[PDB]
C-alpha cells in the first residue's frame, strides 16, 4: 500500500509505534522502523476509505484491537481478526484536515491514545477528540531530506510551537528549536526546506530536571553552531518557582545534533541574578555578543534588552548594557516588557527586533537599529523605531505575532522571518496556557532606505516566499 508515519495531533513529537508488539505513542522512536506502517486496503473490506495498518518490519502483522486495547498481531486469516484490524479513515475529529480511524466493527469507536497507550474508545470530549486525531505523513508529504531552492510554505508550518528559532547550517539543513506548550523539554528538528519542518520527525534532546534549577518552565531554546560545536541557549526556572528563570547552555560536539550527545554546561551568568531569558548571539567584525532579556529590580518593566561582549560561547565579559526598555504605550499593554531579541545584519546596520506587550493578541514587535561601525556597547548607538514594526492584523486573521527569528533562503539571497501567532483573537484564561501559538514564515522585504519592511502577518495558507531569479 502506502508507507506512512502516524503522528499525534496533540503530542506532535509522538508517533504510533510498535513497542515489542504492544502499541503506544512515543517520541524519540528507536528503531525508527517501529513508527513506520503500511496502510493497505482493509482486511475486512477493501472499499474506498477502509484501511488496515501493517507493520513494515513484521509483514503480515497489523494493528488489532482486543478488549479495546491495541496489539500488533499476526493476521490469522479469520473474519474476527480482519474486522478488529480494519478502520475507516475519516476527517480528523479535532480538525477535519487531519485523520481519525473509525473501527469497522465498532463504528462509534476510534483509535486513540491515553496514558500514551493506543486504545479503541468512544469519543465524547474535546480532549478525547484530540487523542483520536492523527497526521498521516506519507510519500505525498514534503520530504525534509529533499533540497529545493524555491521556498513555498503552508502556514502554519508547525502548529503549537512558540518562539520558533530557525538556523540554517552549513550542511544544507535548517535546524528548528521552539518552546513546546508544556514548557518542559527542548525539542529539535531539521529539514532542507522550511516547509519540511512541518513533516520532520522532531527529537526531544533534553528534559527538565525533577528538582531545583532547570526544573521549572523551559523557554525559547536557540541552537547555534560556534567554533566547531553545537550550543543550545535556553531559559529555565526552578522546580519551586517555575518563573525564577535564568539562562542555561547545552553543548554537543557531535556533528549531527539530532543523534549526538548533549552535555549541560550550567548557567550563563550575567552581571546580576534576576529573571533572565530569551538569549541569542551574533558575531560582528571578530567580536561575539550575547543579546538577551533581563529584569532590573530598579526598573518597573518585566524585562529589558541587554547586550554584552562574549568570551567564547559560554560566558559574557565586562558590563552588560541596556539597549531597550519599554516606554511606548504599545510596549506596555497588559504589562511593560521587551523580550525575544533577534538579530539581522544588512545594509551597514545591525537590526534587532524584539517583542513587547503581553503574550495575547496584544503581543507585537519593535525594532532597534545601530550602525554596524558604531560602538555596540554604547546604548546611544541603538535607536528604537517609534511604532511597532509587526503586529496583529484582523484582515489576515493573525493575532499577537512575535518572538521571531531570521533565516535565509537556501541560496542565502533573501531574508525570511519565522515567528509565531494565533489565528484567533480572544483567549480564555492565562495566555501562557493557551497552546495555540503556531510557527509560520514570510519574506523580509527591504525598503529603498535600507531598512526592513516586515509587512503584515500573512493569512493562513500557501505562501510563495521565494523563487530564485534566473540570469537572462
Ligand atoms: Mg496494548
Ligand atoms: Mg530567541
Author numbering: 6 to 477
Quote the study's own text.
Here, we describe the structure and function of AtAbf43C, an uncharacterized GH family 43 subfamily 26 (GH43_26) α-L-arabinofuranosidase (EC 3.2.1.55) from A. thermocellus. We solved high-resolution crystal structures of full-length AtAbf43C and its individual carbohydrate binding module family 42 (CBM42) and GH43 domains, including a structure with L-arabinofuranose molecules bound to the CBM42. The predicted 580 amino acid protein consists of an N-terminal signal peptide (residues 1–19), a CBM42 domain (residues 29–160), a GH43 domain (residues 179–488), and a C-terminal dockerin I domain (residues 511–568). Taken together, we demonstrate through structural and functional characterization that AtAbf43C is an active arabinofuranosidase, specialized in degrading AOSs to arabinose in an exo manner.
To determine the biochemical properties of AtAbf43C, recombinant AtAbf43C (Residues 21–511, lacking the signal peptide and dockerin I domain) and truncation mutants AtAbf43C_CBM42 (Residues 21–167) and AtAbf43C_GH43 (Residues 167–494) were expressed and purified. However, AtAbf43C exhibits a unique domain organization, with the CBM42 at the N-terminus and the GH43 domain at the C-terminus, the reverse of the arrangement observed in SaAraf43A. Furthermore, AtAbf43C is the first enzyme in the GH43_26 subfamily from A. thermocellus, and only the second crystal structure of a GH43_26 enzyme that includes the CBM domain. Interestingly, despite the reverse ordering of these domains between SaAraf43A and AtAbf43C, the individual GH43 and CBM42 domains closely align. Structural alignment enabled identification of the conserved catalytic triad (D168, D283, and E344) in AtAbf43C, which we confirmed experimentally with site-directed mutagenesis. When purified and tested alongside wildtype AtAbf43C, activity on pNPAra was completely eliminated in any of the versions of AtAbf43C where one of the three catalytic residues (D168, D283, and E344) was mutated to alanine, indicating these sites are critical to enzymatic function. The H408A mutant appeared to have a small and statistically significant (P value ≤ 0.05) increase in activity relative to the wildtype enzyme, suggesting this histidine residue is not critical for activity. Natively, AtAbf43C is likely an extracellular cellulosomal enzyme based on the presence of a N-terminal signal peptide and C-terminal dockerin I domain.
